[PDB]
Amino acid sequence: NFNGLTGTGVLTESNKKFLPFQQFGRDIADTTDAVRDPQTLEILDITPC
Amino acid sequence: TRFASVYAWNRKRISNCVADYSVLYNSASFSTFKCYGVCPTKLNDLCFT
Amino acid sequence: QDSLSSTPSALGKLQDVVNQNAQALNTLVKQLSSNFGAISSVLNDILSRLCPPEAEVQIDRLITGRLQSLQTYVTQQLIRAAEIRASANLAATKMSEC
């Protein structure tokens, strides 16, 4: 649960170059596939299990 | 102690804080408590800008 | 050998099959972004915001649309498969007779 965003999957460090104002990314299915950790500001990849 | 008129309603902005809605929804002091687009019992773990 | 090496469009018959299948799958996935009348295309948004009596109505709308989208996909695949089968049947005949 990231800042109210709930889901399940494997989390890893992302190589996606987010700009400072960006909190998350989305796929073509309108699902979130990357988030910014609200404490460490690290970008994480999200893939289901 | 005092409240604004309806023609000149007052706006207070809430930000940069943690909110406990459990004190509000479970209060017996309210005659009306109607939510739209969200459940008050689930509001207690959501985030907003 | 020289003709194939100099003509990008030579194998369109095979490329079209690849393209048509890719466009059907991508279309199917994109339908997951559809609301179908629901408050959100995202199922988790519905479950996180609303309780069971009102969530079920919103979920039913997504189920109806997503089921319809999948039925459309499968019907198209069956029709497309039949066309490919006929092509394969012709190819098998040519192998035997040519």
Ligand SMILES: *[C@@H]1O[C@H](CO)[C@@H](O)[C@H](O)[C@H]1NC(C)=O
């Ligand atoms: C969390 O606190 C740290 C300092 O301890 C700060 O650098 C960071 O930006 C805070 N995160 C948020 C979202 O405010």
